[PDB]
């Protein structure tokens, strides 16, 4: 096979910046290069075919160049909706082959999270388990720390996290931490708290509730 190598793997840039992604063919392919855009969790979309032709409906800020072995895709003024993984494919030879991807993430100003905590539902404690969720909504940069404390500093190590991809509108992330304990373990303790540390906050934030609600 003809190997397609992209460079870099990742970039972060601000909006308005010009970005250039390279793709090398391990040997000459003339102009038989296409470029795709894939938003996380979606089918890839054609931007450019024959190294430089824009597909109908693609924004004029996308352009491509190269012939032979070296190709460049340029986004001349990066916009938030350009967050995506970008692939080059050759179609000069069979097997048709893709490059490894260049993820482009958008840089922006820090945004402090909104924090929410949710107790186990009733019908969940009916099945003998209790999931407690802490939500950090809409923040930038992605690095944040969530600490669980049950009966004040008895802070735990039995949670899982999930972070969404960058939003194409405002460039933020959201995150959830789920603490799971058995109905008996939950019915034993009374103060459940989520403590958050992130750059945009002036102090660690805590959202707590008492096992009992009202």
């Amino acid at each position: 096979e003809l190997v397609m190598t992209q460079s870099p793997s990742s970039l972060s840039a601000s909006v308005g910046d010009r970005v250039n992604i390279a793709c090398r063919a391990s040997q000459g392919i003339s102009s038989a290069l296409a470029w795709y855009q894939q938003k996380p969790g979606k089918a890839p979309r054609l931007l450019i075919y024959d190294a430089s032709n824009l597909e109908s409906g693609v924004p004029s800020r996308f352009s491509g160049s190269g012939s032979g072995t070296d190709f460049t895709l340029t986004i001349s003024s990066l916009q938030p909706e350009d967050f995506a993984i970008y692939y080059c494919q050759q179609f000069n030879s069979y097997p048709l082959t893709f490059g490894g991807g260049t993820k482009v993430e958008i840089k922006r100003t820090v945004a402090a999270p909104s924090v929410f905590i949710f107790p186990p539902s009733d019908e969940q404690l009916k099945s003998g388990t209790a999931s407690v969720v802490c939500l950090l909504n809409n923040f930038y940069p992605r690095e944040a720390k969530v600490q669980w404390k049950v009966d004040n500093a008895l802070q735990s190590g039995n949670s899982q996290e999930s972070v969404t991809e960058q939003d194409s509108k405002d460039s933020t992330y959201s995150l959830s931490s789920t603490l799971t304990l058995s109905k008996a373990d939950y019915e034993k303790h009374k103060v459940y708290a989520c403590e958050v540390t992130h750059q945009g906050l002036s102090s660690p934030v805590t959202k707590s509730f008492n096992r009992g609600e009202c």
Binding site: S114, P119, Q124, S131, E161, T164
Partner: protein, 225 residues
């Protein structure tokens, strides 16, 4: 229109079985183009598997799949299919059909189908439990509140979550599922909302786990008395 290329649903197949994925063409002349078949394994690059002319029925494929891939098209039903035999764990991937603009085999691909996830596993299919993440326990003060649905202990991916049957789409955050130590998945979906509506509005999450044929619509009501 329906889509333009549309594919069949996600499937779990045991190692050693076979999977058949379809791809129905609507709104263009089916026999004037070729269709390519591409897969993407988790965290990997796209891998070309083969092509079928919808006019002649002729086939080209990657010798990586020599002996275990077949391509067929039903010209009357305007559907093409790919058969993949002797399924190994490493065939867990999203399978796309994509169109060849020119019908010759070697091309860029201008329309893609949406993908069907084939998971190769011996674990049984398990449909989810949806539990409400009820807004507040009287929190309020500021302006926005959040509410959601916890979709606990299903297998395999995917699960589809909608809010008020699709009419509420702003501010929805459906998180990537996490695989638990038992092998089952969990996911949350939340919406951030003006609390001023918490008493006038009814929020329903609409969970669909097509591999188990489970449909669930749950009302998220405030943690109320």
């Amino acid at each position: 229109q329906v889509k333009l290329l549309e594919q069949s649903g996600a499937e779990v197949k045991k190692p050693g079985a076979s999977v058949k994925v379809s791809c129905k063409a609507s709104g263009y002349s089916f026999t004037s183009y070729g269709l390519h078949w591409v897969r993407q394994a988790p965290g990997q690059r796209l891998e070309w598997m083969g092509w079928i002319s919808a006019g002649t029925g002729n086939t080209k494929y990657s010798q990586k799949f020599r002996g275990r891939v077949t391509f067929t098209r039903d010209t009357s039903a305007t559907t093409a299919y790919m058969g993949l035999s002797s399924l190994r764990p490493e065939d867990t991937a999203v399978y796309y059909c994509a169109r060849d603009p020119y019908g010759g085999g070697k091309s860029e691909f201008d329309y893609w189908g949406q993908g069907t996830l084939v998971t190769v596993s011996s674990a049984s299919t398990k449909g989810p439990s949806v539990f409400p993440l009820a807004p507040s326990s009287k929190s309020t003060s500021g302006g926005t509140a959040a509410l959601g649905c916890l979709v606990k202990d299903y297998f395999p991916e995917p699960v589809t979550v909608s809010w008020n049957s699709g009419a509420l789409t702003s501010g929805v955050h459906t998180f990537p599922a996490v695989l638990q130590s038992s092998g089952l998945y969990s996911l949350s979906s939340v919406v951030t909302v003006p609390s001023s509506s918490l008493g006038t509005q009814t929020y329903i999450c609409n969970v669909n786990h097509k591999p188990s044929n489970t449909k669930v619509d749950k009302k998220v009501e405030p943690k109320s008395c």
